[PDB]
Scaffold this active site. Structure first.
Site, PDB file in Angstrom:
ATOM      1  N   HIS A  18       0.782  -1.224   0.000  1.00 26.24           N
ATOM      2  CA  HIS A  18       0.000   0.000   0.000  1.00 26.24           C
ATOM      3  C   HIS A  18       0.833   1.304   0.000  1.00 26.24           C
ATOM      4  O   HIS A  18       0.340   2.299  -0.511  1.00 26.24           O
ATOM      5  CB  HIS A  18      -1.051  -0.032   1.108  1.00 26.24           C
ATOM      6  CG  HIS A  18      -2.078  -1.061   0.852  1.00 26.24           C
ATOM      7  ND1 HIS A  18      -3.115  -0.847  -0.015  1.00 26.24           N
ATOM      8  CD2 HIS A  18      -2.188  -2.348   1.276  1.00 26.24           C
ATOM      9  CE1 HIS A  18      -3.845  -1.948  -0.094  1.00 26.24           C
ATOM     10  NE2 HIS A  18      -3.301  -2.869   0.685  1.00 26.24           N
ATOM     11  N   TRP A  88      -6.817   2.234   5.435  1.00 26.46           N
ATOM     12  CA  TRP A  88      -6.774   0.983   4.657  1.00 26.46           C
ATOM     13  C   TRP A  88      -7.051  -0.214   5.554  1.00 26.46           C
ATOM     14  O   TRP A  88      -7.667  -1.185   5.114  1.00 26.46           O
ATOM     15  CB  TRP A  88      -5.451   0.812   3.870  1.00 26.46           C
ATOM     16  CG  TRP A  88      -5.703   1.066   2.441  1.00 26.46           C
ATOM     17  CD1 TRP A  88      -5.620   2.278   1.778  1.00 26.46           C
ATOM     18  CD2 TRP A  88      -6.158   0.120   1.501  1.00 26.46           C
ATOM     19  NE1 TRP A  88      -5.995   2.110   0.468  1.00 26.46           N
ATOM     20  CE2 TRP A  88      -6.367   0.808   0.271  1.00 26.46           C
ATOM     21  CE3 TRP A  88      -6.474  -1.256   1.567  1.00 26.46           C
ATOM     22  CZ2 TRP A  88      -6.804   0.161  -0.878  1.00 26.46           C
ATOM     23  CZ3 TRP A  88      -6.895  -1.894   0.418  1.00 26.46           C
ATOM     24  CH2 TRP A  88      -7.027  -1.188  -0.808  1.00 26.46           C
ATOM     25  N   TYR A 134      -6.090  -0.748 -20.091  1.00 24.20           N
ATOM     26  CA  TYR A 134      -6.518  -0.182 -18.788  1.00 24.20           C
ATOM     27  C   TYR A 134      -5.335   0.100 -17.862  1.00 24.20           C
ATOM     28  O   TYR A 134      -5.122   1.242 -17.386  1.00 24.20           O
ATOM     29  CB  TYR A 134      -7.467  -1.126 -18.063  1.00 24.20           C
ATOM     30  CG  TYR A 134      -7.569  -0.651 -16.632  1.00 24.20           C
ATOM     31  CD1 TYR A 134      -8.150   0.564 -16.370  1.00 24.20           C
ATOM     32  CD2 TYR A 134      -6.977  -1.351 -15.560  1.00 24.20           C
ATOM     33  CE1 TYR A 134      -8.216   1.076 -15.117  1.00 24.20           C
ATOM     34  CE2 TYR A 134      -7.026  -0.830 -14.276  1.00 24.20           C
ATOM     35  CZ  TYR A 134      -7.646   0.407 -14.075  1.00 24.20           C
ATOM     36  OH  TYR A 134      -7.711   1.047 -12.852  1.00 24.20           O
ATOM     37  N   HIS A 171      -7.917 -10.085  -6.287  1.00 23.24           N
ATOM     38  CA  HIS A 171      -7.843  -8.770  -5.659  1.00 23.24           C
ATOM     39  C   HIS A 171      -8.023  -8.755  -4.146  1.00 23.24           C
ATOM     40  O   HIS A 171      -7.292  -8.066  -3.479  1.00 23.24           O
ATOM     41  CB  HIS A 171      -8.810  -7.800  -6.282  1.00 23.24           C
ATOM     42  CG  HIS A 171      -8.214  -7.071  -7.418  1.00 23.24           C
ATOM     43  ND1 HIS A 171      -7.534  -7.716  -8.419  1.00 23.24           N
ATOM     44  CD2 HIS A 171      -8.197  -5.758  -7.737  1.00 23.24           C
ATOM     45  CE1 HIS A 171      -7.108  -6.828  -9.298  1.00 23.24           C
ATOM     46  NE2 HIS A 171      -7.495  -5.635  -8.910  1.00 23.24           N
TER      47      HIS A 171
END
Ligand SMILES: O=C1N2C=C(c3ccc(O)cc3)NC(Cc3ccccc3)C2=N[C@@]1(Cc1ccc(I)cc1)OO
Length: 191
Positions: A18, A88, A134, A171
């Site tokens: 992160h 988070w 993408y 994910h």
């Protein structure tokens, strides 16, 4: 629930995953980012690089807003790194709680919005060429070799596409639990 998913917040590899993304998002190295910035980035990508219709873009904007919103980010507020990682932890917990209860996750809702734009056939699945387009637009992956790795880690169908159901599971593992089998999901681009 099909997997048993638990957090691993004290793992330096989770904190650093992160932090990698924080730095990547903080393009002007202010040491803070805002919700305004995050949703601008999202909509710029989908409207100006990926051909999204107005309705598709607004649906995507709402999903990205809710996602970063879940990590504590707000319009008109500058989030620093310590606030970011604290937020988070709350997002990941909340997401794993939904998943365990077979309730739709914020990351799934983002994925459905995004895949409706990116999948030329609008069936919930993308080609490698669509994934490159993408990730390269977003800049989360730069090289074709790294996009290719995504398709190795993930379980592909006979037809050769990446289904939204499979991507979401990966994910959940990559961003929320540090599941070992999800390593290298974005190849070398995100540790
Ligand atoms: O999962 C994705 N993330 C996760 C992240 C992410 C994860 C954790 C983190 O701390 C920061 C960023 N970022 C981006 C890029 C991004 C960032 C802001 C606005 C628009 C695009 C991002 N893009 C995504 C889009 C996506 C979303 C859901 C699904 I299922 C499949 C794909 O591709 O991997």
């Amino acid at each position: 629930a099909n997997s048993k998913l638990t957090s691993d917040f004290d793992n330096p590899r989770w904190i650093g995953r992160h932090k990698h993304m924080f730095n990547f998002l903080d393009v002007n190295h202010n040491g803070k980012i805002s919700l305004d910035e995050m949703v601008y980035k999202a909509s710029d990508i989908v409207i100006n690089n990926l051909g999204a219709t107005p309705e598709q873009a607004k649906r995507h904007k709402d999903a990205v807003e809710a996602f970063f919103g879940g990590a504590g980010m707000k319009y008109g507020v500058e989030t620093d790194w310590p606030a970011y990682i604290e937020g988070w932890k709350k997002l990941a917990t909340d997401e794993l709680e939904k998943y365990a209860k077979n309730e739709p996750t914020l990351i799934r809702i983002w994925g459905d919005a995004l895949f409706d734009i990116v999948d030329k056939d609008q069936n919930g699945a993308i080609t490698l060429d669509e994934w490159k387009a993408y990730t390269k637009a977003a800049g989360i992956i730069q090289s074709s070799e790294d996009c290719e790795e995504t398709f190795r880690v993930c379980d592909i169908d006979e037809s050769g596409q990446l289904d939204v159901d499979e991507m979401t599971r990966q994910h959940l593992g990559f961003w929320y639990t540090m599941d070992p089998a999800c390593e290298k999901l974005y190849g070398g681009a995100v540790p």
